[PDB]
Symmetry: D3
Subunit: 273 residues, 6 copies
């Protein structure tokens, strides 16, 4: 049905399309091709007439550490310019995965087994329902420390779901959206309060409680209600996606993120041993 991925898996159980991030030893850090795979999986779930809920689950102690920056400072494709290179490597993947999350017609449920960073936290903030394992989860958007700007439609999603002043304080000064902030704004639906050392039991418990909750309901009604609710901010989200993917290009081409990435991995010690 689709190519296999050693980092992301999926299955179909009745009306549920379960996606599982299964790379816990790298904190579920995703490359661009993994975000494209996520987009393709959401399309597959969206074109299935038996699916009603799309559940994104993860593994380990984090949900996802964000984009995989492994090896970005190495000097060693062959694009004609920096603009073309960064266009192909950033703009397309970001716009594609953000649009795939924006237009999903099934109910998107996120199971937080830990913290989320970067574009992964941006996709977490694009889900309809969020469940957390315990009160030690947070969302971090480190754009000001890396020399970049908002990604994944957070321009609309973060002030909509957390408030304008809170969004400004967290983004201008590079602070995390903690669990208290998420609870003062109704971001998390249920906190399961489970030990952080087992995400498999948390995922199984979430699936069981979801199966309990859907008994006797008319599911086409749920899809129609979501179709009506999505029309509140769809235009804002599309406009924000288009503007963000092209505004980040000037920061990528200016060279500041590469300078900061290089000086991050420049911490050799004077006296060895």
């Amino acid at each position: 049905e689709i190519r296999q991925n050693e980092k992301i898996s999926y299955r179909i159980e009745g009306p549920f399309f379960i996606i599982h991030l299964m790379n816990p030893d790298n904190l579920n850090a995703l490359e661009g091709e993994d975000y494209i795979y996520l987009g393709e999986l959401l399309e597959l779930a969206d074109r299935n007439r038996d699916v009603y809920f799309t559940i994104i689950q993860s593994s380990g102690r984090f949900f996802s550490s964000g984009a995989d920056f492994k090896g970005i400072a190495k000097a060693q494709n062959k694009y004609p310019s920096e603009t073309s290179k960064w266009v192909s490597n950033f703009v397309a993947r970001n716009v594609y995965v953000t649009d795939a999350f924006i237009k999903h017609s099934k109910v998107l449920i996120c199971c937080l087994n830990g913290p989320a960073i970067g574009l992964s936290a941006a996709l977490v903030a694009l889900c309809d329902i969020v469940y957390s394992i315990n009160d030690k989860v947070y969302l971090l958007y480190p754009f000001a420390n890396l020399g970049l700007i908002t990604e994944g439609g957070t321009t609309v999603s973060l002030p909509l779901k957390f408030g304008t002043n809170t969004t400004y304080e967290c983004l201008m000064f590079n602070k995390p959206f903690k669990y208290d902030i998420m609870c003062e704004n109704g971001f998390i639906s249920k906190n399961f309060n489970m030990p952080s050392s087992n995400a498999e039991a948390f995922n199984a418990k979430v699936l069981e409680e979801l199966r309990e909750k859907v008994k006797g309901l008319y599911l086409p009604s749920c899809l129609g209600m979501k179709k009506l609710l999505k029309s509140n901010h769809i235009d804002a989200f599309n406009k924000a996606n288009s503007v963000e993917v092209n505004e980040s290009l000037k920061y990528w081409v200016d060279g500041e993120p590469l300078k900061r990435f290089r000086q991050l991995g420049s911490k050799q010690r004077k006296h060895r041993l």
Copy 2:
């Protein structure tokens, strides 16, 4: 206007008080009852001495919603039948609540369900009798979708994730969610049996709260504040009433109501 045996009204100074007085049937309303509510709002809106519109109820519930016993209970098709019996009532009452120019105040003497909870969410100020009130929108259990402008009003006043969790799984907007979102302006903390004492206390507090103010200023401020989400509400009204028609036509709400 005409007399209705379930809803009454009166005018006291700048207040236009509407009272649902059918507490033994949990204040369940029919389509003509919603049309009568709309007519009463038009009356209140045309009076130049009226500045506030108070909607009060009686009994243990505020209302139990649309009376389905009058739905099950002439037309060339089912589409025409439901265009006449469902679409028109909803467009009329929802627009009458959306475009009201006087300050709408709801006094929750108990739970509200269905379209009545939708009209509660369209009011400007909501007072509750105690901490046991709630709002229920069982659209997913009845085989229907959002109605009464809840598409815009519920995410606006309770949040997006809360609205999704409550609507997709048929869960009530409880009092704790109301306070976490600032829905109730004042909790009177009175016994749920005596609703008329609650209504009288609300009226006396409103009477003593308007002394020394300039009421045309209140109307101008409301006319300015209404312009924020008026287009969203109008579009939602139209699209809501026209999308819920296929659910009635297919027969799922009627099949589910029969048990």
Copy 3:
């Protein structure tokens, strides 16, 4: 779908052809006929072999508007006009607004009232000759804009033209249609025989669509619709409810009894 003595339909390949077959009464439509039009559009919208919806008529008019003889029990006048006027208008206007197949109107003659309002909602319009026009007699009847014309007429004819035509009860003539590109093709045929006009329009439509990717047409239409969908929905919702204070006041009826 039930059977109607005044409207019929057929399916020929990608085309879903609706035909108004009441020429002796100028194709005047009652409320149930507008609800039947809405049902026919919903029927054409839900089958995957249909790509174009073509609305044709007969006689010398396209339609003379709403049949008022039918409009001439309930606990109130408001209930009466909410169930008799508001419901059918909001339903048929939404049915025309949200249609996903390409709407084509073949003007065999003048259109009046809500039928001209529906003509203004089609995507492509052909005329039989240069004698057609659209008339919205809202000012002479005691009513206001209907059928999404609030958004449709200023968008397709201009603001000043719309004000001049609507405030003084003047028709949108054919030269005004040409100044604005309202009519895609003028077939220039005698106004007597509308049947040959419909047959020629169908032959040209059959010749034009071969070699094209029809799902591409549907996708382009889906994208183009998002330009003014919100405006049309707001306009429908506010029109159908503001036009109610005029009915309950009694001016349209009192003007029709004369």
Copy 4:
């Protein structure tokens, strides 16, 4: 480059442009020319390319008691012309100045804010509190006026619709609990109100600590992106507010209420 106001001063420290309302004996009540001078200072800070944060501080027990009423009650062919010159212009100017600011706006509340100054506080990006005794008061219904300063958009957006209706229709203050329930105050310093100078100094030190390691052009780009969410709503509200307040000003209700 700019003149000197005896009630408002300014200075530039690195990336910070600090504005100081320095008339605590009269509760920092501002006249029309003072609001125009505030707008001019915001334009000056917006044109300086080394400034990234605009810090607006104040003195005494209040942040500002609003427009100077004793200066309002004052050459013109009619009353319409008089109130177009004296009210509409200054309000539209200062509101557009706060709406379109490119640098990060940070308000330091040393006390209650009332009227148009509260409306300007509601237009700031980040607000700090000296203690838990601060509030905002919009007494438009008690003065015979309507919403001004952009509050039509900013109050329901930051405090909710039902709370805004309850507070505006009945002349009640947005208290500190309402602020905490909506996340309006970013930090509460919990210092005694008898010293706003120490509060301002500590805010400046914390802001100096919190900027190390940040790419500031990225902060400006992120604010530029976030501003475009409600910019059209604010622009639409400005005109309608300043032009609908005129029918209230020319009827004489505000003056006869202040003169009694």
Copy 5:
């Protein structure tokens, strides 16, 4: 209302008529004259017997715009130009934007500047002959669009025409106005006699208004105005505050002095 020596008004049945009566100074208006125009529109909008507001003029020009001779006390240049330019402009533009009666303009000749903006901001426009035009010399004066023209010019003439005319200081000539339906009727009278033109317009308006229900006209205008009201009163405050930097810079003053 206070009496003005350059603008008068009268009421005839359902018509509120405003006459600019300074033909020897080419009908140049000052800031107090624009505030007086706003007051007159408020007076017309406040009484229940008026349904149409008609703006007329005299001489060879409809109006030459703002009196630059007049504008050629305050602690700053900004505080001067906020009280002189911004307030009058925002007031008169909001007055013309929110008017609920049917605005009709009788163009007896060219209109320049803010007068041309008010002309383009009306609902119906008549012209005395084919020698009328609108000039917006913002680029030649060191200024930008005013009077809500950012919305009204591309809406009523198109984006490309508006760009070509505003970037290079060219007039919106009569053929351009007749390509977009800006003028509803051309009376084709001699430019020497504007009084006969005004009288002919008035008698034709009296003839056209017979047999209609005028509340229907008012309701239809109320509905049609919601199409672009937000864009209009959103661009007003942005225009008046963006022009302030150009006024404070001193370019329009340095340019007018030669």
Copy 6:
């Protein structure tokens, strides 16, 4: 500052930034890197503070014949390949044309097709060499949908019904339609073979038309005028690229090109 391209050049003359498409033998067909280079040139013009007008000219008998298909006809899937090939270049060049702060002027020396026609419809002022220029958007014939922002730009500048008739049936926007809609500011009525003389005459007249004007005034006026439809253009670009992606993936465009 910028690389060298053998199909596009540029220069600066006073306040004019002149871009020249100099590949007449291949009908000025552009590849994806050519569109990225065009966007880079627009950014270069937008950063220069001495430039006020951006002039885009071409050569030969066409203005451009659209995207080069020989280049269209390593990646884990077809979705990834088509994302990286098509979506990025389209969103980038469309955003580059939508947000430009200088006055964009296009000199039509002949027909324009496809994405080049979309960019021509995205410019502020268009001049024509003669009455034989046209615009063609063959999306329905290639199995594609609207691109380059045409969803907003075509109905805005040519009308809704005309746009539907021209897009649904793959018909060109001829010079007649452009004249009835005021799309072309001036027709120069020069011979088709005189494209260089056409460019020179356009430059001379633009140079004579700017004398005396205040240029910051023109830039501020454009900044105000551009906010009429900016959000619509951004939304359209964002939805267009992602919707056309699946038409690309299904394989109909490649199939239709190979025959």
